[PDB]
Design an enzyme around this catalytic site. Structure first.
Site, PDB file in Angstrom:
ATOM      1  N   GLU A 267       0.807  -1.219   0.000  1.00  0.00           N
ATOM      2  CA  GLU A 267       0.000   0.000   0.000  1.00  0.00           C
ATOM      3  C   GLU A 267       0.842   1.271   0.000  1.00  0.00           C
ATOM      4  O   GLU A 267       0.820   2.030   0.978  1.00  0.00           O
ATOM      5  CB  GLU A 267      -0.942  -0.002   1.204  1.00  0.00           C
ATOM      6  N   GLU A 517      -5.094  -8.817   0.970  1.00  0.00           N
ATOM      7  CA  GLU A 517      -5.682  -8.446   2.248  1.00  0.00           C
ATOM      8  C   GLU A 517      -7.197  -8.394   2.120  1.00  0.00           C
ATOM      9  O   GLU A 517      -7.730  -7.854   1.148  1.00  0.00           O
ATOM     10  CB  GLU A 517      -5.159  -7.090   2.740  1.00  0.00           C
TER      11      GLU A 517
END
Ligand SMILES: COc1cccc(-c2ncc(CN3CCC(O)(CO)CC3)s2)c1
Length: 732
Positions: A267, A517
């Site tokens: 991220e 995720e």
């Protein structure tokens, strides 16, 4: 697929996993499905320093220390074998191993913690023991622990000329250790998920711009003869390269058979890159909560000037404007003074700062963005263009992130020649078009997907919205994106997952997709399930959490049939502090919710205490799914209430199908056991009390393993179905 590797051309090991098509495949052509968890978020901070304890937080890191040993798994007291046994017993064959740049290079630039790398190798050997497939996750959250999350070592903040002890006063970063202030911290009052808003505050806005586009927007920032962009990227890539090199050299047996690939930087933040107007906050910025200054308002604050800033609350449909608060740093500037850079920065860590890197004052004003004398914005679109080519409008993913992934990917395969390139594009962003000069027929799309509403509001609302559809301009009115009721909400989210899968087919190519995720918060409804509210009523009632997880997991079922690693499994999760990180509580297991070898788990003759005790909403994440499929998975459907499980495959003429090549389906004891009572368990073993109806072929069950032999169609392709159900409904 070919017995030769598409990357090397060399022959493949009998455990090679092919990632050349839309699905993972073994050497015999079976389509593989990889489902597991992230292990573990506990490795985001050192020992005895969770996010809410400020004591020792700066002192150890400033001393170059970083004790991450026995995180995620403790190899000393034998606790690691139990946790791994529980994950293999839940039918999981995948692990996203979490490690951070800080744990590898905390001592200083190019001063690597080989003791921790040896620990990682030791844990990786144990996961290989248990038959888990692992792909490494270079993990970070809002750059570093010291800017509100996890990732970079402390000296990287000094590398950018930022004084870590002036972060809270300037609102450049909100830290769980110093909320709402370093003077009187009350970490119990830390707002829900506010840590993510740090990407839109000055510190992350500055560092990330340095990281991905330093040479473009901060050419005056020279450190050790090279620009800050190369300085930060090379050090991070070298650090991850060191861990890859030590694995290939000291324990090469782990590559490809256990460690199948490497993820990109988790991220990554976009900094100010692509900002069309620094005066305002764009409406497309999904997340705003708490005091949210604009870039220029955050810069003026960074110079110690008071600002009156928009405050944002998170309503039932996105953020919305509330208060307008005054943040007054009282002259305290974010920026390190030259004298302190000699004592704590450049001279302390052993690098030389360029002449034109102005210290003590805002680096962006030094590049003409705004004038500090008048506090007036000068170049509002400075980050939307190339200064060297102002006619070129910048795109963060194509112009800067892809360049980084090329540098990162070449270093990975240099030490892991058969590595699968797990490509994690930035959050809420399509991946770019990447050359197969780099991919070479071995890659997997690694996006993250979260039910944003459930995550941000910590509730399982009777409503929800098509967030992705709104982003992709699918609706004339935003109310069209709203769904109410479980049915419509479940079908909607499963449709959002399908759009992530279409990003792989359309952009990268015929490569698998793996949701790196996914998960749901467990500290819902003011921790009601923990008995914290209403006099303890509802303690142990995880019905709200179970439907939230059942929704996200069903979203990866259906026509998707996706690979994913749930986030996460935190062995030291406690009710008071959750996962011990910024108040999040996304772990499937906790000691507060209480009350062995590989082959023993495969036979299925273990205590049900293992698969039940300490778990929360176990019926949601422990699901039946096909481990290996002769052919191609067409559709998966599972219903918790009736335990009915239908699975449809697409079988062709050229698919290999004999008796040693069969479709393998995992049927968990959590839903399909005869009984899970510990009383009955001491005297009798666990076993599947099921009814199977197969449209084709032969079946056979051992322990928790279901085998399905069927002959391939003589011509063309057909669809075989199989349906499993516990005898008599759900286990009550
Ligand atoms: C509907 O909304 C959506 C849709 C698709 C993707 C996302 C996110 N992708 C990354 C996110 C944030 N990250 C930061 C860390 C985290 O707290 C775990 O530690 C949670 C995940 S949200 C949200």
């Amino acid at each position: 697929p070919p017995e030769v590797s598409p990357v090397t051309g060399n022959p493949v090991s009998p455990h090679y996993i092919h990632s050349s098509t839309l699905h993972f495949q073994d050497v015999n052509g079976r389509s593989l499905v990889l489902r597991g968890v992230n292990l573990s978020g506990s490795a985001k901070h050192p020992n005895n320093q969770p996010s809410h304890i400020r004591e020792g937080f700066w002192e150890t890191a400033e001393a170059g220390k970083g004790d991450f040993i026995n995180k995620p798994l403790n190899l000393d007291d034998g606790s690691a074998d139990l946790h791994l046994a529980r994950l293999k017993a839940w039918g999981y064959n995948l692990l996203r191993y979490v490690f951070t740049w800080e744990s590898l290079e905390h001592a200083g630039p190019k001063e690597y913690d080989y003791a921790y790398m040896d620990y990682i190798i030791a844990v990786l050997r144990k996961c290989k023991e248990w038959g888990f497939r692992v792909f490494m996750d270079p993990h970070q959250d809002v750059w570093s622990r010291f800017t509100g999350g996890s990732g970079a070592p402390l000296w990287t903040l000094y590398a950018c000329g930022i004084d870590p002890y002036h972060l809270t006063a300037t609102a450049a970063a909100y830290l769980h250790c110093e909320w709402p202030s370093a003077e009187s911290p009350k970490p119990q009052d830390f707002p829900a998920m506010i840590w993510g808003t740090n990407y839109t505050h000055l510190a992350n806005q500055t560092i990330w711009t340095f990281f991905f586009a330093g040479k473009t927007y901060a050419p005056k920032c020279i450190i050790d003869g090279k620009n800050i962009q190369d300085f930060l990227q090379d050090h991070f890539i070298d650090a991850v390269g060191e861990l890859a090199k030590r694995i290939a050299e000291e324990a090469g047996d782990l590559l490809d058979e256990c460690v199948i690939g490497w993820d990109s930087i988790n991220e990554p933040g976009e900094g100010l890159i692509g900002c069309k107007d620094l005066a305002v906050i764009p409406a497309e910025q999904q997340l705003k909560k708490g005091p949210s200054p604009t870039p220029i308002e955050g810069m003026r604050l960074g110079m110690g000037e008071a600002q009156d800033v928009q405050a944002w609350n998170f309503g039932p449909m996105g953020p919305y404007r509330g208060s307008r608060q005054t943040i007054d740093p009282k002259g305290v500037k974010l920026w390190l003074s030259k004298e302190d850079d000699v004592k704590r920065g450049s001279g302390k860590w052993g690098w030389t700062r360029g002449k034109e890197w102005a210290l003590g004052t805002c680096i962006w004003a030094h590049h003409g963005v705004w004038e500090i004398a008048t506090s007036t914005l000068l170049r509002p679109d400075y980050f939307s263009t190339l200064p060297t080519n102002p006619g070129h409008q910048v795109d963060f993913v194509d112009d800067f992130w892809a360049l980084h992934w090329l540098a990162y990917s070449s270093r990975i395969r240099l030490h892991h020649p058969e590595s699968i390139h797990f490509i994690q594009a930035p959050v809420l962003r399509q991946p770019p078009k990447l050359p197969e000069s780099f991919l070479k027929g071995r890659a997997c799309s690694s996006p993250h997907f979260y039910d944003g509403l459930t995550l941000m509001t910590k509730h399982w609302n009777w409503f929800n919205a098509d967030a992705i559809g709104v982003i992709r301009k699918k609706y004339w009115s935003i109310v069209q994106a709203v769904r109410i009721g479980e049915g419509p909400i479940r079908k909607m989210i499963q449709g959002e997952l399908a759009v992530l899968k279409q990003d792989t087919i359309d952009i990268l190519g015929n490569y698998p997709t793996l949701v790196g995720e996914i998960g749901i918060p467990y500290d819902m409804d003011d921790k009601k399930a923990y008995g914290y509210v209403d006099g303890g009523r509802g303690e142990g009632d995880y019905s709200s959490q179970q439907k939230a997880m059942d929704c996200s997991m069903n979203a990866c079922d259906g026509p998707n049939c996706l690979n994913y690693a749930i986030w996460n499994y935190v062995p030291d999760n406690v009710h008071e502090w959750g996962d011990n990180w910024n108040g999040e509580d996304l772990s499937l297991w906790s000691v507060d919710d209480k009350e062995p070898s590989p082959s023993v788990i495969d036979s299925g003759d273990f205590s049900p205490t293992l698969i039940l005790d300490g778990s929360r909403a176990v019926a949601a994440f422990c699901r039946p799914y096909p481990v290996a499929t002769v052919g191609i998975p067409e559709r998966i459907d599972f219903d918790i209430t009736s335990t009915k499980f239908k699975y449809a495959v697409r079988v062709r003429a050229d698919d290999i199908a004999n008796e040693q090549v069969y479709t393998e389906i995992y049927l968990p004891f959590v839903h399909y056991a005869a009984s899970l009572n510990a009383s009955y368990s001491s005297f009798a073993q666990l076993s599947l009390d099921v009814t199977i109806v197969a449209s084709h072929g032969r079946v056979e069950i051992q322990g928790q393993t279901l085998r399905w032999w069927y002959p391939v169609p003589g011509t063309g392709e057909e669809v075989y179905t199989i349906e499993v159900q516990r005898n008599g409904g759900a286990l009550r």
